[PDB]
Structure formats: structure tokens, C-alpha cells
């Protein structure tokens, strides 16, 4: 639209001076594309996001790509609008960077695609809906003791190396296998290794066309790692505003979204607060998570993983998100290093839709008996360690005898773990889950060896494995 010269470069931060006085708005997009005139110059193409107005026709911009080789006096052009990711049917089976440019070598998107600005005012109470709909995943622990909800936000909490990304991937796979719905996956500051693994797993599963992917890698400047989640959300918008269906949006690690925001604030000279966090923390978190709502048309249900640093949940980044969550799942390393997979703590995981009238009273009663037995077992293990299983009385003995089997049967083999153990994997219907747990609690299978329950799906698979072992 209009052009101005660079005046200052201080790493990611760049400053431009629009001499004539026509200034870009905040959150606008600026383009630098240069060709070397002398043998000492370099060729660079750069995207800059405006952040401030500084007076006397100067603006302060955060760069979305590495700023090396910038020269004062080189021309910047104004696009006239925010960073606009192309959206539509053209983005299925394709992988993009933050700027909405295809990472894949399968091709380049043409000018035909409709382009949606990443930064848009959040939906009003124009049509937001209060209705509650349960989403089935096929995982016994998750469906039984912490049901997820359409349009709701679900949180996965744990340390490093506990099982979050495997759970996210098998959620994607099972949703495509049974529900058949679209999904969108965005990685905030993702590792190249795990992103490559995810692409290869989706290609093997035949899912890549169902889902879409936006990648933001750690070696990129902080601003891109910040904005990648918003461009992924803008991709997810189209499939429920225009195509009007039940969408999912996955986010790799919001922790990095907060960290990148803090780092950008530091680069901009904003005064720190709390534990080094930026001044505008919750205004960013809320502006992210308040566009993820189910109107009458579509859900944009979200499942998210967030990293807790040191087994402490009081850090500002986990604390702010904890005020947005409809269901929360806590993953424990002690489970992860046991034979019980997936590592999901029954007692620490809760959902606001576990109400008896939402899930049905049979579901509620079965879940409540499950949790009661697990709590009694946790209490009794202290006595068992010192005095043994034989010291306690018959009621406690039967309680622990059922509790161990419940602990094992919560585990099940899944289709993404084929790499790790060479076993196929299973899906369990929700009514089958509740019926099996009801039969276990009622004790129809007291005679079976406890090993049969270790990693199978339906209870008849326990019967088959018991037949196999002998």
C-alpha cells in the first residue's frame, strides 16, 4: 500500500519511519523483500508485525523471521491488513508455518484461496449457546471418570515425558476413526523431531487429509511462536462459521505461548510482573481462549496440554488457564513408569459435566463406586506395605482384590502405540466401558488371574487373554 524506510534494528525488534505520515494500524503486517545490489549485501524476505506507535511517524515492529542481514534505509511496504492466513478446503492435507505458507513440498497454495485475518474481534453474545453435548473418545478412563464436552476446553497437565502427545495423537486418530469429524492441530514452539513424527504417523494412518496442521518451531523468533496458535484458531474458525460442523482444535503447549508473550514484552521494554511474567498476561490468555466457543452452529472443542515445571500447580501460567477449563486431566509420572497406560490419575481428573443428569445415573453410580474403591485402596496400601495383605479383614481384602483389577482394566492398548509394543490396539464403546466396569465392581470375574486385565480393551478381551495365558 505505502512504503517506509527502516531506521533501527535491535534483533527481533525493528523500527520503521513512514515519512509521509500514513501509518499502519496496530497488529498490521509489513513486508520486506530485498535483492542485493553489491556483492556485500544479502537477499532477505521478512514479515513484521506492528506493536506500537512511537511518535514522529515511527512505529515499532516485532519480526516473525530472523532479522540477520537487515540494513538501515531499506524499504518496507504496508499490506494494509493483519497477517492473513489462506483458509478453506485448500488447507486439508497441508502443513503451514505461522505466516500461512505451506511447509510441505506437495505444492504451493495459489491466489484462489480465501484469506482470513488472524486478529478478529471475539464473538459477542450474538448466538453463543448454553447447551451441553458429550464427546466420546473410546478411552475407558477418560470417558468414564472425566467426560469431555463439545465447545468446552479440556486440559492435560503433567511433567515432561509423561504421555501427553501420544494421548493427543490417539485422540485425533480415534476421532477420525469413529466420529469422522475434522480436526486442526497447531504446535506452539514444537520440536522438529516430534512434529516430523506426527506428520509421518498421520501419513501412515491415512488421516492427513482429514486434519490440518500449522507448525511453529522453537528456533523461530518469539513472535511467531506466539502467533501460531492464533493462526491455527483462525483456520479452525472457517469449519464451524462457514461449514457449520463440529470441529476440534488441538494445541501442543500453551506454556510456550505464555513464555513467548513474556519474551516479546521483555524485548519491548514492558515492565515485568509476577514471576517474571509480562504485564498483559491474562488479557492474552483470555483473548486466546474466548474465541474457542460453541455457538449454535459449531463447537471448536479444544484439548490442550500444558507443562507444569516442578510438580507445582501455582505458577501463573497454569493458574490462569485453570480458570478457563471445563474438564482437567492430570497425568502422573508414577503411572507412566508403571505398566498402566495411559498415565491418567483417576482422582485428580474431574469434569463439570460428570453431573448425573448429563451422563445418566448408571454412569454416575459406576464412576462413584470406582473412585470409592480406588481411594480405599490408596489408604490401605500403607498397612499392606508393613503388615501385608493378610493382616486386614475380609472386607478390606475384597476391596483391594477388586481395586487392583480396576487399576489394570483402566489401561488399554491403543492404535498409536503400535510402534512401542507391536500390539494392534482397541476401542471400547462407552456403554461397553460402563457395563464392563459394572461387572468388575459386582465381581463377576473374581476367579480370573489379575494379569488378564493388563492392557486389553473390552472385558471379553480379558476373557480371551485369560484363555491364552492359562
Amino acid at each position: 500500500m505505502t512504503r517506509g524506510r527502516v531506521i533501527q534494528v535491535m534483533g527481533p525488534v525493528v523500527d520503521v519511519k513512514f515519512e509521509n505520515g500514513h501509518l499502519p494500524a496496530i497488529y498490521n503486517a509489513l513486508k520486506i523483500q530485498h535483492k542485493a545490489r553489491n556483492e556485500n549485501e544479502v537477499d532477505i524476505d521478512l514479515t513484521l508485525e506492528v506493536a506500537l506507535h512511537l511518535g514522529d511517524d515511527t512505529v515499532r515492529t516485532i519480526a516473525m523471521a530472523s532479522t540477520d542481514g537487515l540494513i538501515r534505509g531499506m524499504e518496507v511496504i504496508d499490506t494494509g491488513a493483519p497477517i492473513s492466513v489462506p483458509v478453506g478446503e485448500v488447507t486439508l492435507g497441508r502443513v503451514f508455518n505461522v505466516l500461512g505458507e505451506p511447509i510441505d513440498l506437495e505444492g504451493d497454495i495459489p491466489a484462489d484461496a480465501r484469506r482470513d485475518p488472524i486478529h478478529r474481534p471475539a464473538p459477542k453474545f450474538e448466538e453463543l449457546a448454553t447447551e451441553v453435548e458429550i464427546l466420546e473418545t473410546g478411552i475407558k478412563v477418560v470417558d468414564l471418570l472425566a467426560p469431555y464436552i463439545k465447545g468446552g476446553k479440556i486440559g492435560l497437565f503433567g511433567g515432561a515425558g509423561v504421555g501427553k502427545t501420544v494421548l493427543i495423537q490417539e485422540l485425533i486418530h480415534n476421532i477420525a476413526q469413529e466420529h469422522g469429524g475434522i480436526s486442526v492441530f497447531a504446535g506452539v514452539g514444537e520440536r522438529t523431531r516430534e512434529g516430523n513424527d506426527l506428520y509421518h504417523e498421520m501419513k501412515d494412518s491415512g488421516v492427513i487429509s482429514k486434519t490440518a496442521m500449522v507448525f511453529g518451531q522453537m528456533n523461530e523468533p518469539p513472535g511467531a511462536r506466539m502467533r501460531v496458535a492464533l493462526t491455527g484458531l483462525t483456520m479452525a474458525e472457517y469449519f464451524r462459521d462457514e461449514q457449520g460442523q463440529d470441529v476440534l482444535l488441538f494445541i501442543d503447549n500453551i506454556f510456550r505461548f505464555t513464555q513467548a508473550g513474556s519474551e516479546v514484552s521483555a524485548l519491548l521494554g514492558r515492565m515485568p510482573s509476577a514471576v517474571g511474567y509480562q504485564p498483559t498476561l491474562a488479557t492474552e490468555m483470555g483473548q486466546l481462549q474466548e474465541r474457542i466457543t460453541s455457538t449454535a452452529k459449531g463447537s471448536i472443542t479444544s484439548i490442550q496440554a500444558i507443562y507444569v515445571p516442578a510438580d507445582d500447580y501455582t505458577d501463573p501460567a497454569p493458574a490462569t488457564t485453570f480458570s478457563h477449563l471445563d474438564a482437567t486431566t492430570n497425568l502422573e509420572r508414577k503411572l507412566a513408569e508403571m505398566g498402566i497406560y495411559p498415565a491418567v490419575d483417576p482422582l485428580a481428573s474431574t469434569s463439570r459435566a460428570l453431573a448425573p443428569e448429563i451422563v445418566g445415573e448408571e454412569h454416575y453410580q459406576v464412576a462413584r463406586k470406582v473412585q470409592q474403591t480406588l481411594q480405599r485402596y490408596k489408604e490401605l496400601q500403607d498397612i499392606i506395605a508393613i503388615l501385608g495383605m493378610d493382616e486386614l479383614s475380609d472386607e478390606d481384602k475384597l476391596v483391594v482384590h477388586r481395586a487392583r483389577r480396576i487399576q489394570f482394566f483402566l489401561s488399554q492398548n491403543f492404535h498409536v502405540a503400535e510402534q512401542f509394543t507391536g500390539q494392534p490396539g482397541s476401542y471400547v464403546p462407552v456403554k461397553e466401558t460402563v457395563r464392563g466396569f459394572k461387572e468388575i465392581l459386582e465381581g463377576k470375574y473374581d476367579h480370573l488371574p489379575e494379569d488378564a486385565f493388563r492392557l486389553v480393551g473390552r472385558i471379553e478381551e480379558v476373557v480371551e487373554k485369560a484363555k491364552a495365558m492359562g
Binding site: 531506521i7 533501527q8 534494528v9 535491535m10 534483533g11 527481533p12 556483492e39 556485500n40 549485501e41 544479502v42 532479522t67 540477520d68 542481514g69 537487515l70 540494513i71 538501515r72 502443513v95 511447509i103 510441505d104 513440498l105 511433567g159 515432561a160 515425558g161 520440536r191 522438529t192 523431531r193 512434529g195 516430523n196 513424527d197 506428520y199 518451531q217 522453537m218 528456533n219 523468533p221 518469539p222 506454556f255 510456550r256 513464555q259 513474556s262 519474551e263 516479546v264 521483555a266 524485548l267 519491548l268 515485568p272 514471576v275 517474571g276 507443562y307 515445571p309 516442578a310 513408569e337 508403571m338 505398566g339 506395605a385 508393613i386 503388615l387 501385608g388 493378610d390 510402534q419 512401542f420
Partner: protein
């Protein structure tokens, strides 16, 4: 134009007039002949950091720009030498005579260029090989306090690569030079020097040099990877690199951050650590695996830099001084150390035995915490304590005595199946060495079976061979 006077000089930083066509990161040289990088471009001045002895510079000196980025000379002739961050020898012995040069600021291997990590990297440390396995391409972090056996693990790793076909690099950042010499002599005495390169950026060296040292190491590692050879790289301390970067940034008047660290810490360490990779069969299958080190005060794992580096890496090896002085060396906390490539970067018999070993250790780790205090226990409670004690004894090994994998898997097979029940705990340590000798002399066929097959030998042969030794032992 290119000519301009220097208007300020101090603490290894300068500011200059003119230079209106300079570029970010461009190398700049003074009339004194020392060189420096232009890092900040302002409305009428340039901020320059000096890569050398700066005391000679004065106000009014004219300054010039080279027109290039910093290039590290790369060649096969560097192996065995000791070098600076710059491409200049400091070991004597005359010029290294490299083939050519590479810019140190480069993009990393991207997505779809990488295969899954499937081939092991062998350290010879029973605990690490069994319970925290590593593969070519993995970015495993080793983190701990002072004097808890950190660099002995890197030296053990580099020494063991003699049997394999690895290329290794050791980068020392901000350390005392006599420590560099002691490590070089330790390596040379064990014969490892010919397949290694040592890069030295001591603390006395001008601060920008310590800023460039890790990238100096990766530049050579990348050349060797793209040729197609496997590479192992060790950074001895990223903490001192962070300190040098903070000092350089503060002198430049860039706005501070959490612990006064600048806002570019994560950007810099990720730019550094994303160059490690495992390349595809199309590229050539080369691999640049990295083992960065971080030390931080008093076992507080929760600081800025420790959490950044923990968030960037694929695993952590946690070293505790508490465990060191308890008689368990090298002091590794198996519970707190995370392995994300556990079963994929192991040979088949290692997977098979080590899964049960980790099950035993995890079972023992909780019962031991409090059951010992109650002297009277049930019969079966104490048995797991005995098993865990024998396990922790079996995982201990002397300094600079790395082990081949097959003897490890043999002794761990002896452990897991309960063959060590008769042996009192004190005899267990001698049992391992005498068992190794007996298998070397008598049961060589098992070693041959594992060496050829890459799989566990027939159970009957293993049982007969292990049982035969127990008869001699007293």
C-alpha cells in the same frame, strides 16, 4: 559511507559514527587490527562488540566493515587438534590446514528431512544404557550440581566411541585452561584423541568469543554430518554462555528480563540446539547428536536457564550430590531422569531385560522410602528391598571403565532372574568382575551369539554359562 570514527570505547564494547550501509551481524575491524561484530543499528550510531584485546582502541579511531559473516574453517585436518572459536590453532603444531569455510549463522535441518531415532549410542554406563537410553540424534541434557560426576560421563562416552565409528567434539566454555589441558591429557592417555576435536573458549577470552563458541562447535559437526558420518557433540556449560550473553546484552543497553537475562535467551539456545538432527536416507543418514551440560545452584532445578534447557531437550539426566556421597556413583536419579526414546534406541535384548529392570527399580523406589524404618516386616516386603539393594549395587562402576553392551545385558540377565540370591551384597561387586572374566575365558560363545545376532542367546546356553561360574565363586 563505509568510513566512520569511533565515539565511545569501554568494557569490550564500542560505538561508532557513519557506517550507514552496515548490516546486522557484519564483521568489523579496527585500525588496531582487532575484529568485532556490529549488533545494534541506531539512528546515528552502531553498537559493536569486540572479539579480541580491546585496550588499544581510542576515541577518534576510524573503523571499517569487512563485509562478511563469521566463517569457521572446516576440514578433516582438524581432528585431534585444539582450536579457538575462531579458526586459529592454540596448541602449537602450526596451521591446521582446513579445506574451506562455512558461515556459522545457518539454518537448521527441517521437517521431513529426519528419520525416527532408531540406532543406539553406547556410553558403557550400565545405568544410563539400561534405564536412560540414548540414540543418534537425541538431544539429552545432563544437569546437576558441582562435584557430582558430570564430565566423567562425557569423557566415558567419548572414550567408548573407539569401538564404534563416531566422530566426537568437546567444547569447553568459560573454563580454566589447565582444566582443558587435564581433560585433553585424560583423553590422549586412553587413545581417544584421533577421533575428537577440542574447542576452547576460556573465561579470560573476550566475552563475544564465549558467545560464539557453541556455534563454532556445531559448524564443524554439521560439516561432518552432511558428509555422512555420525557426530557426537558435548557443551560443557551452557550457563557460562548465558552469563556471557547477559553481560554483552547489558553493556549494549538492551532492556533486561527475568533474572536480568535478555529476552533473546530462548531464541539463542533454540537456534543453537535445533541443528542437532538425524538425517534421512536421502540426505545420507548422517547424525549430529548433542549432550549439553547445565549446572545451577544448590539443586534448584527451577531457575530460568535450567527450565529453558529442560523445555528444549528430549530428556534429562539428573545428577545429585546427595547420591554421590552415599556410595552410589555416578550419582544418577533414575526416577527423576526422563527417557523419551526408551525402547527405540536400544538393542532387542537390552529392551527385553531393561524393561523388567526398570519395573524392579520403580517397585523398590517407594517401598525402600519408609519400610526400612519399621524393623519388623512381612516376609515378602523385605525381598523387594533386597532386590533393589542388589540392583543399586550392580549399577555402580569405577571411573573410566566403560563396558561393552553384551556383558551389561548378561549381568542384568543374571540380576533380574534372581541368580544373585545366594550372594551376600558385599560379594556382588566382585561377582560382576569375576563373572566378566569367566565369561571372557569360558563362555565366549554367548558373547559371539549376541555380537552376531543382536539378540538374547538361547536360554539354555545362558543358564548353563551363568550357573557354571557360580560354582567357582566363593
Amino acid at each position: 559511507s563505509d568510513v566512520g570514527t569511533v565515539i565511545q570505547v569501554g568494557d569490550g564494547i564500542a560505538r561508532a559514527h557513519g557506517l550507514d550501509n552496515v548490516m546486522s551481524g557484519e564483521l568489523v575491524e579496527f585500525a588496531n587490527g582487532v575484529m568485532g561484530m556490529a549488533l545494534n543499528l541506531e539512528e546515528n550510531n552502531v553498537g559493536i562488540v569486540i572479539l579480541g584485546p580491546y585496550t588499544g582502541i581510542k576515541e577518534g579511531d576510524e573503523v571499517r566493515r569487512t563485509g562478511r559473516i563469521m566463517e569457521v574453517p572446516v576440514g578433516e585436518a582438524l581432528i585431534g587438534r585444539v582450536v579457538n572459536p575462531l579458526g586459529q590453532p592454540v596448541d602449537g603444531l602450526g596451521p591446521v590446514e582446513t579445506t574451506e569455510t562455512r558461515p556459522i549463522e545457518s539454518r537448521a535441518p527441517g521437517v521431513m528431512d529426519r528419520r525416527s531415532v532408531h540406532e543406539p549410542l553406547q556410553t558403557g554406563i550400565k545405568a544410563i544404557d539400561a534405564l536412560v537410553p540414548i540414540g543418534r540424534g537425541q538431544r539429552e541434557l545432563i544437569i546437576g550440581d558441582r562435584q557430582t560426576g558430570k564430565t566423567s560421563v562425557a569423557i566415558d562416552t567419548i572414550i567408548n566411541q573407539k569401538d564404534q565409528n563416531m566422530i566426537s567434539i568437546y567444547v569447553a566454555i568459560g573454563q580454566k585452561e589447565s582444566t582443558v589441558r587435564t581433560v585433553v591429557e585424560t583423553l590422549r592417555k586412553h587413545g581417544a584423541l584421533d577421533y575428537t576435536i577440542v574447542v576452547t573458549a576460556s573465561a579470560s577470552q573476550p566475552a563475544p568469543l564465549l558467545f560464539l563458541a557453541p556455534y563454532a562447535g556445531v559448524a564443524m559437526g554439521e560439516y561432518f554430518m552432511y558428509k555422512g558420518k555420525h557426530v557426537l557433540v558435548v557443551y560443557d556449560d551452557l550457563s557460562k554462555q548465558a552469563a556471557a550473553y547477559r553481560e554483552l546484552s547489558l553493556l549494549l543497553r538492551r532492556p533486561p528480563g527475568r533474572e536480568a537475562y535478555p529476552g533473546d535467551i530462548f531464541y539463542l539456545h533454540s537456534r543453537l540446539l535445533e541443528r542437532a538432527a538425524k538425517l534421512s536416507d536421502a540426505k545420507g543418514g548422517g547424525s549430529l547428536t548433542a549432550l549439553p551440560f547445565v549446572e545451577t545452584q544448590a539443586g534448584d532445578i527451577s531457575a530460568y536457564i535450567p527450565t529453558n534447557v529442560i523445555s528444549i531437550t528430549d530428556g534429562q539426566i539428573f545428577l545429585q550430590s546427595d547420591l554421590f556421597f552415599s556410595g552410589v556413583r555416578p550419582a544418577i536419579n533414575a526416577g527423576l531422569s526422563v527417557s523419551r526414546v526408551g525402547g527405540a534406541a536400544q538393542i532387542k535384548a537390552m529392551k527385553k531385560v531393561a524393561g523388567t529392570l526398570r519395573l524392579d527399580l520403580a517397585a523398590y523406589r517407594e517401598l525402600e522410602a519408609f519400610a526400612q524404618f519399621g524393623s519388623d516386616l512381612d516376609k515378602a516386603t523385605q525381598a523387594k528391598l533386597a532386590r533393589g539393594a542388589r540392583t543399586v549395587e550392580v549399577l555402580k562402576q569405577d571411573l573410566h571403565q566403560p563396558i561393552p553392551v553384551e556383558k551389561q545385558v548378561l549381568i542384568i540377565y543374571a540380576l533380574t532372574r534372581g541368580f544373585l540370591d545366594d550372594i551376600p551384597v558385599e560379594d556382588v561387586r566382585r561377582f560382576e568382575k569375576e563373572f566378566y572374566l569367566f565369561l571372557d575365558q569360558n563362555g565366549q560363545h554367548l558373547l559371539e551369539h549376541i555380537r552376531t545376532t543382536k539378540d538374547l542367546p538361547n536360554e539354555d546356553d545362558l543358564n548353563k554359562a551363568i550357573e557354571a561360574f557360580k560354582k567357582t565363586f566363593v
